[PDB]
């Protein structure tokens, strides 16, 4: 496959080729709206490994956020507020300038008939998965609120336990 070359290229973020392409694309994204639909992801490898498939129901929205709460998280919440009939799967980074952080956000149509019949993604249809980022359940949100497995990561103390026999 041609994907192995893609993230190896994507890792070299200070390369001249990526450095040029970031700026020309950043100049363009500044001149569309702050949020706008994209026909296809600018990094197909990144979206693909984040759960995107090139089939009806999946959709990509590009967005930019002022720098200076995480920039990643604010991207999803604004997209979810915009495309309010969708369940937003994930998000990933693309570009910066001196002032902006650019993100591309993957959303899945919960009511679409192609998504509902695909067992790998039906879990997003179930009602508990609506507006995850308002609840902080996405990849960045789960990491932001410190949830993980380890020693490194309230109302079980302030409560007073009074058993029947004490």
């Amino acid at each position: 496959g041609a994907y192995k070359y893609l993230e190896e290229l994507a890792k070299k973020k200070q390369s001249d080729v990526n450095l040029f392409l970031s700026r020309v694309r950043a100049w363009e994204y500044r001149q569309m709206n702050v949020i706008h639909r994209a026909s296809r992801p600018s990094r197909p490898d990144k979206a693909r490994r984040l759960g995107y498939k090139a089939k009806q129901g999946y959709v990509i929205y590009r967005i930019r956020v002022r720098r200076g709460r995480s920039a990643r998280c604010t991207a999803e919440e604004r997209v979810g507020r915009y495309c309010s009939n969708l369940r937003v799967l994930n998000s990933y980074w693309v570009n910066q300038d001196a002032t902006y952080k650019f993100f591309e956000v993957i959303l899945v149509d919960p009511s679409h008939k192609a998504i509902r019949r695909d067992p790998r993604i039906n879990w997003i249809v179930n009602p508990v998965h609506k507006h995850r980022e308002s609840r902080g359940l996405t990849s960045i949100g789960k990491k932001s609120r410190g949830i993980g497995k380890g020693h490194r990561f309230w109302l079980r103390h302030n409560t007073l336990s009074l058993r029947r026999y004490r």
Binding site: N158, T159, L160, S161, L162, R163, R164
Partner: protein
């Protein structure tokens, strides 16, 4: 705030009805799955034997059942655990062996015996696994003679100095590499 326990008899009765409902749902098969014999991991508890999560892939390989068949017939499989002392190989092996020996698998598709599952089916009975497969504690020894060679073995000859030898091993090893 203030956690009260006035539901304690109620919660106990809920679990009873949970077990009775669960058991009656799957009556033919035992209510409780089997667990391996495992040793607690610390110097305070390492002498004891308790029930672990599942049998490691070494043991199912030795016992002659695949990791797929074991899950179907009620043998839990633990992949994280790895068993290194071949007794832990052993003690879990016949544990699987005797479980298979007392196990009776009802044939699928209208009771024609497939492979070696079983032939009789009227022997359907729901038994406590810890009855047929209780977990025992360590086998302690009793009434062993002689060992007067251990008599001359005057304990601290090992303990006091080997503990000092262990303490000073790093300094000693540094010394040997230094003058070399």
């Amino acid at each position: 705030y203030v956690k009260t326990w006035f539901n304690q008899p109620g919660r106990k009765l809920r679990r009873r009805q949970a077990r009775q409902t669960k058991a009656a749902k799957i009556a033919p098969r035992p209510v409780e799955a089997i667990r391996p014999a495992v040793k607690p991991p610390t110097i305070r508890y390492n002498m004891k034997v308790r029930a672990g999560r599942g049998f490691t892939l070494e043991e199912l390989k030795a016992a002659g059942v695949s990791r797929r068949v074991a899950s179907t017939i009620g043998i839990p499989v633990d992949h994280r655990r790895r068993n290194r002392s071949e007794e832990s190989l052993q003690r879990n092996v016949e544990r699987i062996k005797v479980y298979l020996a007392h196990l009776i698998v009802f044939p699928r598709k209208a009771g024609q015996p497939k492979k070696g599952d079983a032939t009789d089916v009227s022997g359907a009975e729901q038994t406590d696994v810890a009855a047929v497969l209780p977990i025992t504690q360590e086998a302690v020894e009793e009434a062993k003679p002689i060992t007067e060679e251990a008599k001359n073995f005057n304990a601290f000859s090992t303990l006091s100095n080997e503990r000092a030898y262990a303490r000073y091993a790093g300094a000693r090893a540094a010394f040997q590499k230094k003058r070399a």
